[PDB]
Design a protein around this ligand. Structure first.
Ligand SMILES: Nc1ncnc2c1ncn2[C@@H]1O[C@H](CSCC[C@H](N)C(=O)O)[C@@H](O)[C@H]1O
Ligand SMILES: [Zn+2]
Ligand SMILES: [Zn+2]
Lengths: 629, 276, 255, 255, 255, 252
RNA sequence: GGUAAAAUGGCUGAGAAGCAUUGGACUGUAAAUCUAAAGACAGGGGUUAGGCCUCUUUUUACCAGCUCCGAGCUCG
């Protein structure tokens, strides 16, 4: 038997993170409710995934399986031969649906253990699956609860330690209260002296908890039983590095870089509870957020203070918010790609919906998220790579919730995307959870310059899109990145034009279509060093993007989609003129800020002097190795 | 204390523990708070007793065994000849500085290892045909390093032909003619310069905290250099930091007109496959 | 005996030159200290008593030595003994290939002038001073004692100029002894080893300790009182002439 | 053998230097005659062939010796042997009581700097040139040979300055040989004694004829060819270093 | 040139004497090896050819030396060169206080009876043979070369009997050179330092390396071929007489 | 000084040794005369007083020197100074071509036995005697002074054997001083020139006395004794040869 | 910033042991010895029955994921 066993709260149920546990043991590791952004949080806090044998999903819902594809492709790159999923039987259909936009994922092996399957035991823990059906093949009323029993460890004579069990219960709504109460299997452990359940993790809204029946249900487990509750009432910072960076940059320009936003124990990030050595509420790694320390560290930098002083002594719509400026994997500072455009105070357009985009939006706007989602008019998806579209279902569900809370009619959203995306969402809607009743999708090919009206419904939808977003015209073109990869361009009645490239290479159709653009957003994955790799991987370098922008003769040029090689900042080639800018998570850019952007280069150089120096040293070492090769 | 009970019980189990124990090392044992530290300390005592007992049997095994030009008094003559060479080097030799400012960052075990490496380095320097003029800069009196050095050398400490001082290398030599050797330096050592003064940090740093010597050098605006280990051999495994004796032998080989491919013969072979 | 003798001691304000002055004044002789005005010769002259007079002079200058001899003749009336103890040293290799350094000619010239040229100047002027002395019943008019370190026979590394000057003194000892033989003046030379004078203290302490330890017997630095004893022995003995005596301790200096 | 070697011979326009140059050039070596401009060395250099060149220089001045060494390096590209056969000589007693004459300081200074200081100047400047030669199989880089007459050991009446300079040369040989030992340069000294050079021929004919009879064997004045032969033998032998050789024919000078 | 000369070499069956014989025979001379019968010199004489003849004799006794000289005169007709390169070495302290041991008199006596008495016996017997030669056009009749050591100048601990014998040769080389001057015989002495003779190469590798490092330059043990070269140079030079040459490498023996 | 100090003087019946004994006994020391039985040194020992004892011995014989040292130990209790002033002398050319005469080996060997072998025989035994002394506060246990004439440097015609023995002593001085240095014994050598010894004492003696540069006369054994006392008193004289000559360098 | 493997502070190992290092010895020619000192397999943690399990550092390799079915460059 293992010598130590403890739990850990990766996410505490906050609206922008979901909930998830992490069962650590010397022999095995387990995960519960892999939602959106769980991979980023676990990577930030150094939680290894090397031996993540089993992943337990308590409910077939996008709030519990959102980040499943990301974890699967990470474990694969990790080299794990087989991973086993446990939960509702619909996972098999979900796995089939994932392959529509991804590949066949041959390398890693996937297995499913539904609740109807026989019980699974390990070298450290026995797991029982309890199916719960709400009152009153897609099934929208199934929730699985888990009861994990540890193996008995013989004493060292030291008396042996009997196995202590813990229970994970999910109660998404009041309709599930009675089925949980009336379940006979729970009474086997609850009303008895058999290994009185050490800790029970409750993930249910606070309105459910205050119910008398639920309150009596928890109390019947005994006085010694603990109770942990991840119920969206947590007040804890999840992304410490993001908060640090945003607070530091806010010191430069507040507008361009706005600031972010019965006994029971409310969960916190990195909260632990040991079970094998002893039984205590460890609480040794609880995150602590203090902006004063961050600004002190920023001010003590060798060159930051003088640079910001020099910049400061020198001295509207539409406005662009860069929610995410990273390419493949989510990282500590940069999320996956996204871009919010605010055409009018009452309308908005989402330019790309990466995984966990809603989380970044909620962090950026705080309590204003409900109002913002009301103004969301359309979403554009450019090419069906992962981490460019996987965050869409979260946006749709949260938009429905925000519309319900704000008291507005449920009108379907407009989605401009390749027709291949229809199959993925169609299968997910048919097999797992209803989604399609929220969107009215428009194929991207129908908006081409030489396109033709496929159906009168499509023409009606595009006309409705133009009316809602108040745009004069919407255009798309096929960029040279992959099969069915599209750009976009928006022209307002005011006359300003915005062009979004997407993943691409230097192309001529984009230049022809986006002529005389007011603001250009272009992919800048790599630098001049690896132009061969960029050609091989179908991506553009920094100077390539700059040349494309200059040839198209845009007023300003913005770069994003930076590679994982890049940690904090890209290189700043002497080619960086007053027109070329750079993007960071959560900055706001307005048309009046174009002259200001070049002035921000010295402060940004000072704030990241060590990082850019280390990157330059690494590049020099690589060049020396290449020369000596 | 009660530690002797567990000591005897583990000795009965024979779980790599010393046969006996003394009072002072016992107090040091209770001054270890982690069971890992106590286990490591007991294993250190255990391996000490074993090697001490094992080497004793060699004495027993050895116990089973005209016109001349010179009397067999060679050891005295070699010692006197090395003394004369060292006396000349103390006047006309090229200075070499060992910086003892790293006394704070070293634990007791690393301190003892530093003293042993310093002993070996001085011994190798004495035997050379053209010795350096070894300096012990920043050697605070009655410090831990100084006390250990006078304990190991005993009465020889007052007769060693090297300059030991409490001052700093900047207070003895012009700042231009000082080069601080370190593995983290960006500049790569090309050739040995006979007009410069080389500073070697008397450091062990097993609990790796790189950049200490580089920070100390850059604090005084001193020049820095690193050995071109990479340019001449295939580095496979192991940190590029070298021991003090290896560094002094490399510098001695370079000082005596030797080439790089010959000076680097003292780098351990377990770290590199071979030359380029 | 040395009672009533008048001695002129060059460099007699420190080191070997002061010990002989102390011993001769204690025995009952009269001494004149010949040293540079910068050195505290007047303090030692006052300390030694009324039989000691400090004469500020430079051995390398003919006029200074002439004035000092005139002062000695005026104060005491005669000169019977002359001891040459003044001498400087330099530590510089002839050529350093690794460092690319060459011995300067100025250092060599200055050492040669102070050690060798000054000794000959004092000898050739004090000899003229003794030439007027009435012959002793043994026919002796005066004694001249020089100092030439053991580097004249066994030089060390970086000791080229000092060895050259001392070797010049040793080589010229005999011809001067033959020159002054008709006028009854004895010329003798002493070759001190490591004697712990201020000259030797310029070396680091550890080097001095090692050099002291390498003396066969006694294993210590020389005592200037022993040098003074040997000087008195030379004066009393009438048959010592034109010979170099090594007051060393049987030390042979390795490279 | 000495074939291909380049030699710099100070005073190589008459006497022992000219004889050494003649023998060395005859064996196939290359020689550079270093002497005063008025010494007539250009005629000797022309006579000895294109393998011998004349460099006008004064050994007592650093600049002239440096220019001569630069000329030798330009002509031949290498310096392998440096033989010092230069030096003036005077004769005056230290003090003449019967005549009231005292030895002049100017004559002593002139003899000292020409004989002793000039030799060291040439040695220190030449050692820089020899240090650039690549060491041979035996590690040798060059040979330096000096001259110091037997007056350094047993001087005569009036040879005070001469004996001082020669004794200084003899005494400084060992420290210089120890200095250049790591470099790989051998230093040796020769004591010619009585030779048929014009210096000995400047004395009255009867005196020289009597002197040739005082040599035990052979009872004649030294032949400069014999000195040249000894110089070549010193050059060829690799184990002769730091030693003074008396080429005097077993003569010991009397008062 | 040494072509046609007949040389008598004592202790010439091994060591320095064998090398001297090899070089002299190689240049066209004739040699007679003079060494003990058990030394195996007959094989060496056979190897060197019919120009070399082994003479079994002991230098301590007069009769064997006379027999060897008679054999040499019978075989070749004359004796022109005599080289004394035979001797034993003994190391023993004068007194050891800790061990209570004293230098036995027999060890001291037997060293003198070979190194010193034997050398003089050979010299006095050979000088009679060389006196029958018709004088050379330079007046020379023969050359005698002895072999002292640097122990005669810087003896080490234990070399008290060795230095006494070798010191006697250095002392007597001059009076003998004056004795044979009327006859026309030159007597010279060589004092080799550390040479790679078979007696010394038998030492372990570590001490051999230390001794090689002791020599300043060249930092190696001496080569007997260099000793033979110096002997030939002494033979050829007519003006070398009554002088000791130190073939050492500038090594001053450590105490 | 030399008060209460015991000295063993070889060849003290007459010559330089007798003058050394006279001076040392006069200064308050104790002397032991070591000479041949027929040398008549018993009368001199009686004349000097109760501090002088005549011990008949032959330096070439181990037993005689051992018995003499035992007598000195019995009489005074310790030995502090040893002055080796004994020695014979012989004039004979190595080879005389006109007469055909050759130097005899027996004559050469006889001089070596007395001058060189006798000095070492006395030294090696008196050093053992001196080793039993308690070290002086300066570390000194005893002083050994040898005599080796100036023939060791410039020998005359016919002085082959004499120069050989004297040069042997001069060469032997340094290694013996190094041997006895750890014990604490100083070994020093004096090189007298032309002295008024009975051997040297009309035309030849007058010419030789004139030959000395200064003083133009023969040496004085009193001056030799004074030099011996000075060497004894001075603590830093060791392993060196002093030439008490008068600046005279002999000629062929 | 990630993924995987490794880490001997005198050097090789083995998993014990050799070659080494420092202080002392006036060595009779095996001192080729005697004697005293220092012996920690990256560093922390844990446990542990070794041995594992984990954290950190360093060295050396490596770092996108377009799925369908027939029309077969478009169609769902
Ligand atoms: N590879 C290398 N190149 C140059 N100097 C080196 C070196 N390895 C060690 N040294 C020198 O020898 C010392 C050994 S200790 C090295 C540890 C030190 N904390 C550091 O990493 O800088 C170093 O301090 C440095 O002075
Ligand atoms: Zn992308
Ligand atoms: Zn893409």
């Amino acid at each position: 038997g293992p010598n130590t066993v403890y739990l850990q709260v990766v996410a505490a149920g906050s609206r922008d993170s979901g909930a998830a546990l992490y069962v650590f043991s010397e022999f095995n590791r387990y995960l519960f409710n892999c939602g959106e952004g769980v991979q980023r949080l676990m990577q930030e806090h150094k939680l290894k995934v090397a031996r993540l044998d089993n992943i337990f999903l308590t409910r077939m819902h996008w709030s519990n399986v959102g980040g499943l594809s990301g974890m699967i492709l990470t474990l694969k790159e990790t080299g794990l031969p087989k991973c086993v999923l446990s939960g509702p039987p619909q996972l098999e259909k979900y796995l089939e649906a994932i392959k529509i936009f991804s590949g066949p994922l041959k390398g890693i092996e996937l297995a499913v253990r539904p609740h109807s399957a026989p019980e699974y035991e390990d070298e450290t823990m026995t797991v029982y699956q309890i199916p719960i059906h709400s009152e009153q093949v897609r099934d929208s009323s199934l929730v699985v609860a888990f009861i994990c029993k540890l193996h008995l460890k013989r004493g060292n004579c030291t008396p042996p330690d009997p196995g202590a069990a813990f229970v994970v219960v999910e109660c998404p709504d009041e309709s599930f209260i009675q089925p949980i109460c009336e379940n006979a299997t729970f009474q086997r452990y609850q009303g008895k002296a058999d290994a009185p359940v050490a800790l029970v993790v409750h993930m249910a809204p606070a309105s459910v908890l205050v119910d008398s029946r639920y309150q009596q249900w928890m109390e019947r487990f005994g006085p010694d039983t603990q109770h942990l509750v991840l119920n969206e009432n947590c007040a804890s910072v999840h992304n410490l590095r993001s908060h640090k960076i945003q607070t530091q940059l806010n010191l430069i320009h507040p507008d361009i870089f706005p600031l972010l936003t019965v006994p029971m124990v409310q969960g916190e990030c990195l909260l632990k509870y040991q079970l094998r050595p002893r039984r205590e509420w460890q609480r040794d790694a609880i995150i602590t957020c203090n902006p004063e320390e961050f600004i002190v560290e920023a001010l003590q930098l060798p060159n930051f203070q003088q640079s910001v002083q020099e910049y400061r002594r020198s001295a509207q719509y539409p406005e662009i918010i860069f929610l995410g400026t990273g390419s493949a994997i989510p990282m500590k500072i940069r999320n996956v790609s996204a871009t919010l455009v605010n055409i009018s105070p009452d309308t908005s357009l989402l330019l790309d919906c990466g995984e966990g985009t809603f989380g970044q939006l909620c962090r950026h706007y705080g309590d204003q998220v409900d109002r913002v989602l009301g103004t969301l008019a359309a979403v554009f998806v450019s090419h069906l790579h992962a981490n460019h579209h996987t965050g869409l279902p979260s946006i749709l569900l949260q938009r429905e919730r925000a519309l319900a809370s704000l008291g507005k009619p449920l009108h379907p959203l407009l989605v401009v995307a390749p027709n291949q995306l229809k199959a993925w969402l169609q299968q997910y809607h048919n097999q797992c959870q209803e989604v399609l009743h929220h969107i009215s999708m428009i194929p991207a090919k129908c908006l081409q310059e030489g396109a033709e009206i496929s159906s009168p419904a499509v023409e009606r939808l595009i006309s409705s899109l133009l009316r809602t977003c108040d745009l004069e015209e919407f255009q798309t073109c096929l960029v040279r990145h992959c099969k069915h990869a599209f750009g976009c361009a928006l022209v307002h009645t005011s006359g300003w034009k915005v062009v979004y490239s997407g993943d691409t290479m230097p192309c001529e159709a984009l230049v022809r279509m986006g002529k005389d653009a007011t603001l250009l957003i272009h992919e800048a994955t790599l630098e001049d060093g690896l132009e061969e790799e960029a050609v091989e991987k179908t991506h553009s370098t920094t100077s390539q993007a700059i040349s494309v922008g200059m040839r198209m003769n845009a007023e300003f040029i913005m770069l994003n989609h930076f590679s994982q090689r890049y940690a904090k900042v890209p290189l700043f080639s002497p080619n960086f003129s007053e027109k070329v800018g750079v993007a960071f998570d959560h900055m706001k850019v307005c048309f009046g800020d174009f002259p200001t952007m070049p002035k921000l280069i010295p402060p940004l150089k000072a704030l990241f002097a060590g990082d850019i120096e280390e990157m330059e040293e690494r590049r020099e070492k690589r060049e020396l190795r290449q020369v000596r090769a | 204390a009660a530690t002797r009970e567990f000591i005897e019980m583990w000795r009965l189990l024979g779980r790599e523990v010393p046969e006996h124990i003394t009072e002072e090392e016992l107090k040091t044992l209770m001054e270890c708070v982690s069971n890992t530290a106590k286990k490591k300390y007991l294993k250190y005592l255990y391996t000490k007793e074993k090697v001490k007992k094992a080497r004793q049997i060699k004495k027993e095994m050895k116990a089973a065994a005209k016109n001349f030009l010179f009397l067999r008094l060679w050891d005295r003559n070699m010692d006197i000849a090395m003394g004369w060479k060292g006396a000349q080097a103390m006047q006309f030799g090229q200075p070499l500085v060992f910086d003892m400012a790293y006394e704070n960052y070293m634990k007791r075990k690393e301190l003892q290892n530093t003293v042993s490496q310093l002993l070996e380095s001085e011994g190798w320097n004495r035997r050379n045909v053209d010795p350096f003029h070894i300096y012990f800069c920043n050697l605070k009196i009655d410090g831990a390093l100084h006390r250990e050095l006078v304990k190991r050398y005993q009465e020889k400490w007052d007769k060693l032909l090297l300059t030991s001082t409490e001052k700093s290398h900047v207070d003895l030599f012009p700042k231009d003619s000082i080069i601080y050797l370190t593995a983290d330096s960006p500049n790569v050592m090309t050739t040995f310069r006979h007009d410069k003064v080389y500073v070697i940090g008397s450091f062990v740093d097993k609990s790796m905290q790189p950049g200490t010597s580089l920070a100390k050098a850059k604090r005084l605006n001193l020049a820095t250099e690193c050995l071109p280990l990479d340019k001449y051999l295939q580095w496979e495994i192991g940190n590029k930091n070298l021991t003090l004796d290896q560094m002094i032998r490399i510098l001695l080989c370079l000082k005596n007109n030797g080439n790089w491919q010959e000076a680097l013969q003292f780098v351990p072979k377990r770290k590199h496959t071979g030359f380029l | 005996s040395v009672k009533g003798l008048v001695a002129v001691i060059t460099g007699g304000a420190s080191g070997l030159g002061l010990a002989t002055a102390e011993r001769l004044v204690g025995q009952g002789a009269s001494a004149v200290l010949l040293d540079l005005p910068n050195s505290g010769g007047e303090a030692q002259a006052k300390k030694l008593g009324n039989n000691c007079v400090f004469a500020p002079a430079d051995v390398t200058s003919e006029k200074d030595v002439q004035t000092a001899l005139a002062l000695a003749k005026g104060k005491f009336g005669r000169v019977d003994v002359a001891v040459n103890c003044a001498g400087i040293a330099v530590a510089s290799k002839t050529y350093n290939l690794k460092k690319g350094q060459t011995h300067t000619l100025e250092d060599f010239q200055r050492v040669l002038d102070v050690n060798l040229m000054g000794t000959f100047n004092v000898i050739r002027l004090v000899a003229g001073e003794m030439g007027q002395n009435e012959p002793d019943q043994g026919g002796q008019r005066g004694v001249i004692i020089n100092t030439a370190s053991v580097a004249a026979f066994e030089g060390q590394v970086g000791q080229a100029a000092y060895s050259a000057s001392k070797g010049g003194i040793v080589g010229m000892t005999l011809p001067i002894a033959r020159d002054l033989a008709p006028i009854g003046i004895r010329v003798m030379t002493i070759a001190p080893g490591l004697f712990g004078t201020p000259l030797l203290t310029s070396l680091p302490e550890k080097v001095c300790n090692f050099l002291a330890s390498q003396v066969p017997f006694p294993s210590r630095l020389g005592d200037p009182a022993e040098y003074a004893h040997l000087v008195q022995a030379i004066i009393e003995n009438p048959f010592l002439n034109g010979e170099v005596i090594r007051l060393d301790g049987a030390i042979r200096m390795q490279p």
